[PDB]
C-alpha cells in the first residue's frame, strides 16, 4: 500500500501509504469519494498549517475543502509523528490521467512531498 513520492524539502518524510495504491503504478482517485493517505515524518523544528497544490494537466489548483490543521489529525524537534488524512473529492472534479499532487507544511516548513501517479476517474 506504500507509494512513491519525492521529497521537495529536507527528507523529513520517510514513507507515504494510500489505500489501494502500490509503488509508482496508477493510483486511482474516484471523484465523489473520499481520498485517504497516511504519512509519517521527522520534522526538524519545534512548534502547523497544511497547504495542497494539485495540477490537473497543467490547470494548477489549490485544493478546496482542506482541513488545514495538522494537529486536528495528529510535536517538537528530533522525533517522528504519524498522520492519517482524508480529503473528499467533489463529484464534479475533472478527470485526468496526468496529475501532480504537491503537499507541504513556525519558522519555515516542516515537511514536503510530490506525487505524480494519481489518476482522477469515474
Amino acid at each position, epitope marked *: 500500500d506504500q507509494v512513491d513520492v519525492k521529497d521537495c524539502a529536507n527528507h523529513e518524510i520517510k514513507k507515504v501509504l494510500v*489505500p489501494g495504491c502500490h509503488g509508482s503504478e496508477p493510483c486511482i482517485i*474516484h471523484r*465523489g*469519494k*473520499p*481520498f*485517504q493517505l497516511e504519512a509519517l515524518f521527522e520534522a526538524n523544528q519545534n512548534s502547523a498549517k497544511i497547504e495542497i497544490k494539485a495540477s490537473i494537466d497543467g490547470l494548477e489548483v489549490d485544493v478546496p475543502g482542506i482541513d488545514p490543521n495538522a494537529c486536528h489529525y495528529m510535536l517538537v524537534k528530533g522525533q517522528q509523528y504519524d498522520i492519517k488524512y*482524508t480529503w*473528499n*473529492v*467533489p*463529484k*464534479i*472534479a*475533472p*478527470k485526468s490521467e496526468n496529475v501532480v499532487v504537491t503537499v507541504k507544511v513556525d519558522n519555515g516548513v516542516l515537511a514536503c512531498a510530490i506525487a505524480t501517479h494519481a489518476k482522477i476517474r*469515474d
Partner: antibody
Amino acid sequence: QIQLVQSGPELKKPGETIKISCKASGYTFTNYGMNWVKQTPGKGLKWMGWINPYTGEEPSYADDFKGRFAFSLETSANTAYLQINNLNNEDMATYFCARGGFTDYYGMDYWGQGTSVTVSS
Amino acid sequence: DIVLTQSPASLAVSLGQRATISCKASQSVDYGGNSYVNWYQQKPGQPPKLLIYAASNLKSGIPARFSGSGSGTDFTLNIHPVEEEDAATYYCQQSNEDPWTFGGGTKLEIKR
C-alpha cells in the same frame, strides 16, 4: 429555496424527438452533477446517467440509454436538458432530474416534479 | 450491476408500530469508510424524497421516526412509530459505482 422545475407533460408520436428541460435555482449550478431517472408506471426507478456542469465533459449514460438519449446544458440559464430521439412505446414514462450531492455521500437530494411523456398516435 | 433486493416487497403496519424494510445488495457498497446506500420515499404522483443518505444519516427536516442502519451488503430502514402520512413506497439506492441502481421497492400500507 433550492428547486428544480421541469417542462410540462407531452404527447409525442412514435418516431418523434422530445427535448425535456430542467431549470435549477437557489444553488451554484456548476458545482453539482445532474442525474436523470426514469420511472415507468408499472415498474420502479432506473438511473439513466448524469451530466457534469463544472467540466462540460461528455455525459455518462447507463447501458440502456446509449445512442438515442442526449443530456445537455445551457449553463447561463441554469438549465439541464434530456433529448430523446426516435421515440417508442417503451419510452412512455416519467423522467426526473435529480441533483447529485456535492460528493456521493449526500445522495440525490433535490428532485424535479417529473415530466410524464406519452407516446401514441 | 449492483442488484438491490428489498424484503419485504409489501408491508401493512398499524399506527404507532414498527415497519422494518431490508435492502440486500449483491456486492458491497462500502468505499473509504462510507456505505453508499440512500433511502427514498415516494408518494403517488410525487417525486422521490430522500430520507437517509450514506446508510445512517438522517436528512435534515426528516423526523427521527425514520432510522437507517447497516453496512456492506445489508441495509435496514426502520419507521417507528408509523404514522398515517407514511403510506408510500420506499426505495433503497446505491451510489458505490456506475451504474447507480435502485431497489425494486417496498409499498407500505397503514393498518387501520
